Symmetry: C5
Subunit: 338 residues, 5 copies
């Protein structure tokens, strides 16, 4: 995640121009390797045409260049690229919207589950730890960054997300599917035991707790859905072939022909194809943002800070249900009293 929201708070003279001098999460960082390969190929073809070809071969290359520049428009790169990028961005923001946040649940755990003794504190910490454990299990499933921090469930034990008893219980309950759903059943049974033990005073509070927990379950299931059900591979292949074939054609059709031959559109012989390079910038940049956001849980600069979210959720949840349980600031009249 590269944040620049405070820099664009007001519309000033050249507000977006200052953002062109960034490198992390930038278009140049995503684009420079492909651009260098394209530039090398273009100038190799240029040197071959201008030095390594005879006059008849030069005329043949000029005919081929005019043919390619006349039939480049047959490729609907904008059509397929716009569809693909719209799908990518919609799925990207939907993937952020289903990242689980335990704040409502941790408020309800800190409130409803009573007891300032060790048992009630352990109960609250265990409930919010079950929530964070289910979240970190699905994030281990869907994020390569979280999976690199926790290559195994023993890493989750060594990071405080899982107890050895929970690890043994999860090993006992092993099925050939993903086991991220297990802490939700654990939460349901532990909350039922808490209500039966008098730690939850009313079953309506139990319903509220399980409603928030099931909302988290729905969000984690949506994350599992977006990881499992990818954008269809046919679309990715088609848009890849579209961009690649467009600029493989531009390697030939955008060559500067000899201005002595007086071809239309080739009256002026520059060396740098500025408009072709700009078109490469725009189209291959569109493709590279599609490549960067299609899995926003990886290790790109503009990918989600999933490890930070995991750490913050665990720390904030434990603080909210442990230290802030019935620990209120002194209730005093405010400034606007009476």
């Amino acid at each position: 995640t590269i944040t620049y929201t405070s820099q664009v708070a007001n519309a000033r003279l050249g507000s977006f121009s200052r953002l062109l001098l960034c490198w992390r999460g930038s278009i140049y960082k995503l684009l420079y390797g492909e651009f260098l390969i394209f530039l090398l190929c273009y100038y190799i073809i240029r040197f071959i045409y201008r030095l390594a070809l005879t006059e008849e071969q030069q005329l043949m290359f000029e005919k081929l260049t005019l043919y390619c520049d006349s039939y480049i428009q047959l490729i609907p790169i904008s059509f397929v690229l716009g569809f693909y990028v719209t799908l990518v961005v919609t799925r990207w923001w939907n993937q952020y919207e289903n990242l689980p946040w335990p704040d409502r649940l941790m408020s309800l755990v800190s409130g409803f589950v009573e007891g300032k003794d060790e048992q009630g504190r352990l109960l609250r910490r265990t409930l919010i730890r079950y929530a964070n454990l289910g979240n970190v299990l699905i994030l281990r499933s869907v994020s390569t960054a979280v999976y690199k921090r926790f290559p195994s469930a023993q890493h989750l034990v060594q990071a405080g997300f899982m107890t050895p008893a929970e690890h043994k219980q999860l090993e006992k309950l092993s099925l050939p599917h993903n086991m991220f759903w297990v802490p939700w059943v654990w939460f349901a049974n532990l909350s039922m035991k808490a209500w039966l033990g008098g730690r939850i005073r009313d079953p309506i509070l139990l319903q509220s707790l399980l409603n928030e927990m099931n909302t988290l379950r729905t969000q984690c299931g949506h994350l599992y859905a977006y990881d499992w059900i990818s954008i269809p591979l046919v679309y990715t292949q088609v848009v890849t072939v579209a961009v690649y074939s467009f600029f493989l054609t531009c390697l030939v059709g955008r060559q500067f022909l000899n201005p002595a031959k007086a071809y239309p559109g080739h009256e002026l012989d520059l060396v740098v194809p500025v408009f072709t390079f700009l078109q490469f910038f725009f189209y291959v940049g569109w493709l590279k943002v599609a490549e960067q956001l299609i899995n926003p849980f990886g290790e790109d600069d503009d990918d989600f800070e999933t490890n930070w979210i995991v750490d913050r959720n665990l720390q904030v949840s434990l603080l909210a249900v442990d230290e802030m349980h019935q620990d209120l600031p002194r209730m005093e009249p405010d400034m606007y009293w009476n």
Copy 2:
């Protein structure tokens, strides 16, 4: 479902280029028969023009080719194709979003319905089996893959989804409509009997159970809606005629005319219509992804793994309500305790 999410976690040099070497769920697998038919027709027409026609007939064919290539733009293939594919993809993801998951309901069944004896266990298994039975009935209705696994309700009996008593009850309740809704009424009456029998301690938990069950009912009704209310046949016919007429025109108008005649756009005589083949790739591929996703419950490579979902839901639901009912890992202080 063809999953490649882990392969595109980071935006690297040619990240989408490695996906071009796939065959399952690929554009080539969906496209090769149509492309071979089109290529055969194109080269038959080419051989007829270059070998089987006299000079006057060749001139007539050249006039026809120029006419077709000048009036090919009258076909708005991109317009209707973009509309149709946008509708297909929206309905496709809406169809995935209403695939039922019993995880929230199975958590509430494992928690709320009490009793470690045989009666409470049978009650929990029967409730979550009613949920899975309604889901598998609507999936038998909407998916050809599920219908091929279970051609009859006796197959559902032989697969453990239905008891013979439930089969006889469903035969008694026969109406000329789809009977997928029956296990929801069964769930409601069984949950009411469980609450009246003391197995459910409070009616608020009964409300939670029936809320989750009715959410599953809404999802299954949406699946029934998408199976019944298809994309209107007029749109499918129009987009089919658009693509087919476009490339039937391209069979004539994209022929390489004799370069001795010096027609504009026909100065260079290639043999392979590379740009026409690319246009076929893009447009007919758009059409074939529309054909593949319009019913995502069939047996295509990128269709939903409905049988796997059915098996996983049944197994996970039975494990959650049976073996995990009040079976908790030992509650111990975590690493960050005190």
Copy 3:
């Protein structure tokens, strides 16, 4: 509703090609009258130009044809047509999504409302009949097919949807507005009387019943909204004038001029304007699908089967609350028991 979902389950060779041989819900059935009128006008104009005009009049007609074919592009038919059709299709699926289904409510009525005697059975049947009566009142308001089956409320009495007592009560409560909302107040007061009489054991179940009933009220209000608040007439008039003026221009500008005069774009004299007829097919077909879906509650082939939905909802609701109330299949261990 024309259903073809099972025919397009898999992406096969020419999957959409087999759908071109349909007549019900087809593009040809929606298009043939307009196409015949257009073809007759085109060939009348052609015969007038080629037989009924002198040489100076033929030259004037050629100038007019070239002028019309040069300025046909000033009409943005694709722009307004795409906007209108997107609006039509969005409203069409929103209108289907708010068609009421009483299945969740009938499950809650079959469960919550107790009593296997005649009074409780009559109570359950009356409640679910109030739900179906409100649904059929709003569907009589919004659907011409339902209004043709039930031209009056006495037809609803003769069809079992309304009792004569309910008919007299609705006549007493007459106001100059639509009275579809009355059975919701009837349901609320009858459910309150049922809870006060002990037929509903807890008020939380009463809340669940009224929540489902009010969800049905929201759906029926959305149907009333879509019937009352039409797409603005200005948009319909503009898109109609766009299509009509486009092809009234094409009646002149797409005429095949004399190829002896050697006009550009008129070198080859066909008789059938194949591309103009294809453009008519696509654009006037887009217009005709917009005409067919703008009111999906009429009597078109692809319109909603509202009478079937009404009959199925009534029959299934009465069966669910009457014969299936506390009528459960025998609870026995499943195949995967222990």
Copy 4:
């Protein structure tokens, strides 16, 4: 609101053609003044060119006309117009979707609040009158039609929406903000007093009442949001300048030049610029529908019938909570009994 839904129930021969003969809510009524101004300016310019200019001035005007007709395409009127109209229509239907309907709340008031005596009747009428009063306060804020019916709160007193006691209470609670939210606090406190007084039997029914009332609060807040947060003035100015500059250019560039001079595109001298007038129709009509729907609460023909909605909501709410409270039709067996 101009309703024509019943006229377009079926797709017939020229279904949309009959709608071209309407005047209320029509494109001609919205367009004729601008079209007459444009036609007068066009023919004044035509008469100046053909009568008031010398040959050199005529040649200069011809150069200017060709320049304007060659550079008219630099204006992206379709781009900005499509964006603006899409935003307008989305906000228009969102504004209709948040028009409050008290039907669910009036059903819950008629059911839950008990007492056929004068006190319970007054309580029910006061609660549903608080709902209608909050709705009419926000509609007075957002609609010029409602504000013209009720220029002051004393008009609301004289129309039965407000009592003099409520008027004095609202005058006492005066703050420099809009006071539409006050009847929601009144409803909450009155419903709490009703539950404490035994008129509401259970607090779960109180929760249902306040949930429906808060749903109405959310809808009224959305209406306040759409009235306050307008479409940004920059967009309106840009689309206005786009349409106006396009047709100010068309005043010169679409003039019929002298056909003796044999300019391309000016070979035929008509008098009526039919395609320019059609383009004016489409583009300025798009602009005028955007002008008509941007505030759908005004006094246009296709604007919402807000006063009718207000009157219907008040009358239907008072009838539902007053005359229909525990006033049920006699419960008798239906036609399909046994």
Copy 5:
């Protein structure tokens, strides 16, 4: 926020034309600096070409101008600009839709929390002050205007949003993350204490209070999400480079060449590039509205009035829970009584 909704209530002759004479929130105010820079550069280039260049250099500049005006179309400014502006506007209205309003919660606090003594009043004020404090903490995080009003939490203490005890408690609970979530845990624990102390009569009302508070938590989390997860910097850089490169090209390619040389498109030598300036207006205005709305919480004219919302929410919440608690207008029969 610049409001003009009342001025566009009806579609009149030139309704949007009167809005062109505004300055606050106008396109000219957002555009004039860039337009002056562009005009200065254009006329500097014009004077260099017409005065500072020799005939061969003038011919070279003419070739460069024709080359740039022929290859300007290679830049897809409309494509990327439409995508970016659609994303900006969608995120802008989503950011407004998640601005928290405490009105439902303040109604529930005024109703449910009982006691006209000092303790109950202090309790209600403290609860709604916790709601407003969490809202103002997240608005301090996301808005530069709110942050300028309250540079520190001591400013929130001096503005009555925070007590010194709450300030010390927040200092004690310091973590390296944003602490806007703390008043939600405070609200949960205080509401639990209120229910345990008898100030809240039933736990169902406690559930309603915590549901509204958690809805506010979800809205504030969405605001935190939109502040943190910016539109990807790659998109902003690409659209900035697109607009800037388009008009840097237009600095050369849109120059008026010598009409004596008789270049096509340069037959008439104006001085003011009216269509280029209009294109600058439209495209750079699209970019500037994107710059203005990307952070709608800054200090632009059309940005949200966040400080006004904060002040109004605090004042209205304190009035609703303090002065309006069980302070009802006298309940009297209305005009339509009997």
